[PDB]
Design a protein around this nucleic acid. Structure first.
Ligand SMILES: [Mg+2]
Ligand SMILES: [Mg+2]
Ligand SMILES: [Mg+2]
Ligand SMILES: [Mg+2]
Ligand SMILES: [Mg+2]
Ligand SMILES: [Mg+2]
Ligand SMILES: [Mg+2]
Ligand SMILES: [Mg+2]
Ligand SMILES: [Mg+2]
Ligand SMILES: [Mg+2]
Lengths: 103, 110, 138, 363, 66
RNA sequence: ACCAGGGCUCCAGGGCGCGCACCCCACGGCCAGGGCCCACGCAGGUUUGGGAAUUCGGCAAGCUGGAUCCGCAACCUCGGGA
RNA sequence: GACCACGACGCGGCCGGGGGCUGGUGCUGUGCGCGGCGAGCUGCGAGCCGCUGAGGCUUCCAGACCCCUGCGGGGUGUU
């Protein structure tokens, strides 16, 4: 049960999104990115602070980078099944930040 | 079924719009049990139901533009879209002129 | 056929900037000021394609304004300048400020005795008699 | 009745039906005419498209400086690992004998598998007592071709270890000496400089850039209908007469454009060099790689032997490309003297030739 | 082998790039690209455009000497 | 028909501006699949050079555009034209 | 992804990949912030200057750096 803290480029994840709907498709491409990164089919719980960060400048002007933190854990609904919780990491700059993992 | 009923009850109590009403998200089973205005007033008193403030429409930029216009800042040729008579009525100028001259002429006569 | 060019010259392939219908300046002192292109000498013709010319190409023109003995007359001229930038043979690109042509005779000699404005090396290579009447060759 | 104004046909019927190519690697459909008084030499090679630049060369006629687009085909040496012999049959050519080497490596047997990672690699488990019997029947052949594969891992920008196998005709004299050369060259690399040389014309065989399903205006260059046109302007309007009561195959219809096999003739080799060594010309005294600043766009850097070919080459970069000698005997009378090679950045429009030239500009 | 120096930016123009605009005064000006040409058509002084060599010479941030 | 239609009357706060025009905000009220975007569309931008050669025809598109100051012809029913 | 409407096609599936980050290469044109000029006005002040060819961006290229990371199902041949 690690906790991966990493920078995602929401520009690069949503290049194939429409400019008109960059924000909701960014949620789609992020959850598709988490599943390909950790090869799993557990649900991704996007924290509302993450979703508020993406829609910060409306639907077209998504921020380029975004530091997140992924917590594998059991589901509060059903503890039989694990789940991903993407939580937002507030950072002042992205220059030089390395992706890390810890428990 | 139940919580939009409370929202218009709390709106008629507050005399505001239903969209200006915030329910406590932790307190929905107490909200779903209450059904009378006496109970919804108790939820307002307990703070479960709040009236949100109105959305900010500040007049800072309008007042900053107004006092700048009083100095004459945005009064140039390129900032006029109505005619001279539309922007300042030629009749209103004459009436202000001739009534001032008529008043002081009488005040000389007295 | 009414306006023959008795000795036809080589053409230099470049981006054709003028066409039939292009109003061009007249650079020499023949008394013509603005001419409109009637046809281009040598053009085989394709379906729906307007015949287009580049610098050094022989062009038929009706003098749209100028001296009264010169106006409303079909004339032979050679395109000497072009607003469209064209790639030279060395691969650089050169653009002139206007579209200009110079009235020539049927033997290929210029009618005017001087040319206002410059000509490029393309007009100098094909028409040494034309570029002699110009001030500078660029 | 007759059409009012005549015009040429839109697009060649020589390339219709415009279908997709069956493969990405194209086999040589025709090698040059084998001359027995010629020395023994290979006739084709398989290269990979890296990118384009332009060179500057002196075009003697007085000397006039001209610049010309070239393209750079990275050519790691090809390993000859088999021989194929042919006989002239009244039905055509027939496989006389196929002789493989005892060694077939992981690159070239990646080609024989669809999913290699899940494979057990048991192809070509394969005796050397039958070599002399297989060489002897191979000496009875009429046409000798070697089986050569490319070394795709040497490029490393193309994420492909799976090799491209092809037959290359051994042209020279006395079929005895053809296979004696060919058994000498088994499991040996053949350089691009051994096959071709500079200022000689070659034919390039490749597959074009795929464009997908395209309409008739891109596929054939038919005229866009006027602005008033209901039901669409990028069409052919009349697709046929009443009689014959079918549509002819000569009518431009919408379909697949690109990813077609193309053979382009008389592509002149300007330079044969290596991607590691730095080129210097007589007129430009700077040692620089053939790789431009920032690498070749969508390719990378050339680290193997490269082929500089005048003009454009069929297909996108990183695609395999067959190159053969021309089937007619066409030599270049001109001698190409390359004055300058533009190694400026093709990302954007770079103005520096080297990164040292950029670092000197900014301090 | 370069084309020359740009008349506006002062940059070195590679061979094959640039445009030689001739202005009917028998004067030829070599411009580097279309960005430079658009500034020159708008009659913008190259000292106003901060990245050109004319402005860095004007602001004296261009260099240090030997 | 939970139909982009039609159907009498009343009530619009702030900014811009001549304007209860447009546009933005407030009040009040709202938000009804997924993925990928080939061709051809429908709707909308931009197209070097040429500039009506297109076409039955400048259709469509484009140019002009508010205001201030200046200047304003033939003609005319003397008012206009403007 | 070099192919592609969908199929198909091309590469690869831990000797692997993806993403970060750094460098390269470009584009834009000198960021926010702090501190000197600034027409004048009785401290305000558009703009300018310096730090700052800065900052933003880079979908292309490189990496010897950081992090993550699975191995399920279907079918058919041979003996
Ligand atoms: Mg009045
Ligand atoms: Mg026609
Ligand atoms: Mg119609
Ligand atoms: Mg490029
Ligand atoms: Mg209002
Ligand atoms: Mg145009
Ligand atoms: Mg017309
Ligand atoms: Mg017509
Ligand atoms: Mg007409
Ligand atoms: Mg109209």
């Amino acid at each position: 049960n690690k906790a991966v803290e990493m920078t995602v480029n929401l520009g690069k994840l949503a290049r194939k999104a429409s400019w008109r709907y960059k924000a909701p498709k960014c949620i789609y491409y992020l959850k598709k990115f988490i599943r390909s990164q950790f090869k799993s089919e557990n649900d991704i719980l996007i924290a509302p602070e993450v979703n508020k960060y993406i829609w910060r400048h409306g639907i077209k002007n998504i921020p380029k980078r975004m530091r997140i933190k992924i917590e594998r854990g059991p589901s509060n609904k059903n503890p039989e099944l694990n789940v991903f919780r993407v939580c937002l990491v507030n950072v002042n700059t992205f220059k030089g930040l390395q992706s890390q993992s810890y428990t | 079924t139940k919580l939009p009923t409370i929202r218009r009850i709390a709106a008629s109590i507050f005399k505001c719009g239903k969209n200006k009403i915030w329910f406590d998200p932790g307190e929905t089973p107490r909200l779903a049990s209450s059904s009378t205005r006496m109970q919804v007033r108790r939820l307002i008193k307990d703070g479960v139901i709040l009236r949100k403030p109105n959305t900010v429409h500040s007049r800072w930029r309008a007042n900053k533009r107004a006092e700048a216009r009083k100095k004459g800042r945005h009064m140039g040729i390129g900032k006029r879209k109505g005619t001279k008579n539309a922007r300042m009525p030629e009749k209103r100028v004459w009436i202000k002129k001739i009534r001032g001259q008529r008043a002081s002429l009488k005040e000389m006569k007295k | 056929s009414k306006h023959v060019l008795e000795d036809r010259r080589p053409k230099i392939r470049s981006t054709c900037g003028v066409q039939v219908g292009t109003r061009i300046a007249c650079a020499d002192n023949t008394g013509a000021k603005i001419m409109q292109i009637i046809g281009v000498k040598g053009v085989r013709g394709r379906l729906n394609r307007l015949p287009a010319a580049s610098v050094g190409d022989v062009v038929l023109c009706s003098v749209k304004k100028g001296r009264p003995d010169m106006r409303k007359k079909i004339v032979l001229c050679v395109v000497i300048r072009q607003k469209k930038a064209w790639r030279r043979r060395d691969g650089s690109h050169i653009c002139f400020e206007d579209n200009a042509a110079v009235v020539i005779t049927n033997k290929g000699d210029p009618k005017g005795t001087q040319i206002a404005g410059p000509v490029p090396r393309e007009v100098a290579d094909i028409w040494p008699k034309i570029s002699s009447n110009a001030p500078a060759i660029i | 009745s007759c059409r009012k104004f005549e015009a040429p046909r839109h697009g060649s019927l020589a390339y219709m039906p415009r279908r997709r190519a069956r493969s990405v690697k194209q086999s040589i459909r025709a090698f040059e005419k084998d001359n027995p008084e010629d020395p023994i030499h290979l006739t084709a090679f398989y290269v990979y498209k890296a990118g384009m630049t332009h060179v500057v060369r002196n075009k003697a006629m007085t000397i006039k400086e001209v610049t010309e687009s070239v393209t750079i085909l990275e050519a790691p040496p090809m390993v000859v690992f088999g021989i194929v012999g042919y006989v002239n049959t009244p039905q055509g050519l027939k496989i006389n004998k196929t002789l493989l080497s005892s060694h077939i490596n992981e690159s070239v047997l990646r080609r024989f598998y669809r999913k290699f990672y899940l494979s057990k690699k048991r192809m070509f488990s394969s005796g050397q007592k039958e070599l002399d019997a297989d060489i002897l029947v191979l000496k009875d052949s009429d046409v000798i071709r070697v089986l050569a594969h490319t070394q795709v891992e040497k490029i490393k920008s193309i994420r492909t270890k799976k090799a491209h196998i092809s037959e290359i005709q051994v042209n020279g004299g006395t079929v005895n000496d053809k296979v004696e050369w060919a058994v000498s060259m088994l499991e040996r690399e053949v350089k691009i400089s051994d096959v071709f040389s500079t200022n000689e014309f070659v034919d390039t065989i490749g597959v074009t850039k795929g464009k997908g399903f395209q309409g008739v205006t891109k596929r054939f260059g038919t005229r866009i209908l006027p602005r008033k046109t209901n039901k669409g302007r990028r069409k052919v309007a009349c697709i046929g007469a009443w009689h014959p009561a079918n549509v002819l195959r000569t009518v431009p219809r919408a379909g697949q454009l690109g990813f077609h096999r193309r053979t382009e003739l008389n592509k002149l080799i300007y330079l044969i060099g290596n991607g590691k060594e730095e080129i210097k010309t007589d007129f430009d005294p700077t040692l620089k790689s053939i790789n431009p600043m920032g690498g070749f766009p969508h390719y990378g850097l050339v680290n193997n032997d490269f082929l500089m070919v005048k003009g454009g080459i069929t297909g996108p970069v990183k695609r395999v490309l067959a190159i053969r000698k021309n089937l007619i005997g066409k030599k270049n009378n001109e001698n190409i003297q390359i004055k300058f090679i533009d190694t400026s950045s093709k990302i954007g429009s770079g103005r520096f030739q080297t990164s040292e030239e950029k670092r000197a500009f900014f301090g | 082998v370069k084309e020359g120096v740009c008349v506006y930016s002062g940059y070195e123009v590679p061979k094959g790039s640039g445009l030689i605009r001739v202005t009917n005064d028998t004067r030829s000006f070599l411009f580097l690209n279309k960005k430079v040409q658009s500034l020159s058509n708008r009659k913008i002084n190259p000292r106003d455009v901060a990245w050109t060599a004319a402005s860095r010479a004007f602001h004296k941030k261009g260099m240090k000497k030997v």
